[PDB]
Structure 1
């Protein structure tokens, strides 16, 4: 359910990359979630859905956190 999903997602490299990009753009705290309550916040911001919402549906790779700068890549 939620526990195994939390472990698996926390262990993906993709989670680390998205979380550190969120930290750079100041959407998630630069602490690492100190108490489960902020961990839900970090999961929601990084992945885009609450873990229950992730389990509910079957399309997970898109709502991941996107950079809030939209840099001019030119």
Structure 2
């Protein structure tokens, strides 16, 4: 009993099922404080008594299944956005449970919900935008391209040599 409880209490599937059970009030919102509370929470979440769990060979067949069965066919895009988040959460848990159980016709539903959640993540990405600004060039109407970079230009050769062909030596400072 102790080894089974320790194995399953460290399973992430267990904490996820416990969260789903807490959301709809099937188990107390706090962690168990007594052996009776822990046994009751295990019985509700796993769906089988720890002593009865050894007895058989199934494990995933009776894990909690959320109480409210919303309509996920409105996840077909069709007080809606919070409802959309609720539907995303419940559909994700239901598909997680289906994957654990190897339920038939799962890959197609998984891809469908992946598209749904990509749309939902696009909405959340819209919510997660700090803003952005571009300094426009007034002469144009778009992002400024003016720079103080060097720009090559072939200077006249007189800037280096005089009319007798000798190089310039700028060494006399003239003060006015």
**2:70 aligned with 1:57:** no
**Equivalent-residue separation in structure 2 for 1:29 and 1:56 (angstroms):** 27
Displacement of 1:71 after TM fit?
1.1
Over the aligned positions, Cα root-mean-square deviation in angstroms equals 0.4
Q: Deviations over 1:24-58 (max 9, x none)?
A: 01000011001110100000000000001101000
> What is the TM-score normalised by the length of structure 2?
0.41
The SS at the match of 1:39 is helix
Displacement of 1:14 after TM fit?
0.3
The SS at the match of 1:37 is helix
**Equivalent-residue separation in structure 2 for 1:71 and 1:52 (angstroms):** 34
Extract unaligned runs of 5+ from structure 2: 73-176
The SS at the match of 2:65 is coil
The SS at the match of 1:23 is helix
Displacement of 1:62 after TM fit?
1.1
Return the structure number with greater relative CO, CA threshold 8 A, min gap 6.
Answer: 1
Moved over 4 A (4+): none
**Equivalent-residue separation in structure 1 for 2:18 and 2:57 (angstroms):** 22
